Design a protein around this ligand. Structure first.
Ligand SMILES: CC1(C)CCN(c2ncnc3[nH]ccc23)[C@H](CO)C1
Length: 167
């Protein structure tokens, strides 16, 4: 039993909800919140910009030190950093950005990072400003993630389309 509330169950291990991931994380304070990151961990907009804003830019400060030490992530890769005031940990995961011409096949690799964590709060990878089809992203999530994932979808209209079209 966990403290996630109001989710629709899609499969044995995938759940979904219309919610602002920032407000969700502040309420649940989950062990792991997933950020829709880029390789440089520059958290300017989308989920990343919103999560970083909620931390008063502490996420960005920590991220810049990480990059200065380690260099950029791989597309499809991830790193674990602090969750600051939002969660114990933040798993920064880089899904492909279609608006950069990045291979959508790397979306499965991106979701594989979730399997290293028993329970996660997450957005749909490569959705929003990353330019991928969110229905496809949900399909890959369900077919790749085996651990318990709680998906927050900010847009109410998009949430209804995701549920009504879920196979
Ligand atoms: C098209 C989208 C709705 C754009 C916004 N995205 C978010 N999802 C959940 N929580 C969020 N907080 C801030 C942003 C955000 C989604 C990521 O796929 C897709």
């Amino acid at each position: 039993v966990n403290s996630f509330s109001g989710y629709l169950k899609l499969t044995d291990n995938v759940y979904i909800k219309n919610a602002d991931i920032v407000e969700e994380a502040k309420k649940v304070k989950p062990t792991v919140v997933v950020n829709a990151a880029n390789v440089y961990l520059k958290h300017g907009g989308g989920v990343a910009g919103a999560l970083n804003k909620a931390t008063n830019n502490a996420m960005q400060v920590e991220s810049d030190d990480y990059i200065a030490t380690n260099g950029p992530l791989k597309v499809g890769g991830s790193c674990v950093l602090s969750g600051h005031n939002l969660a114990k940990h933040c798993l920064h995961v880089v899904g492909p950005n279609v608006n950069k011409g990045e291979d959508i096949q790397l979306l499965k690799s991106a979701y594989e990072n979730f399997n290293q964590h028993e329970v996660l709060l997450a957005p749909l990878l490569s959705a929003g400003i990353f330019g991928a089809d969110p229905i496809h992203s949900l399909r890959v999530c369900v077919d790749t993630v085996r651990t318990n994932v709680y998906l927050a979808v900010f847009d109410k209209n998009l949430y209804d389309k995701l549920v009504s079209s879920f196979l």
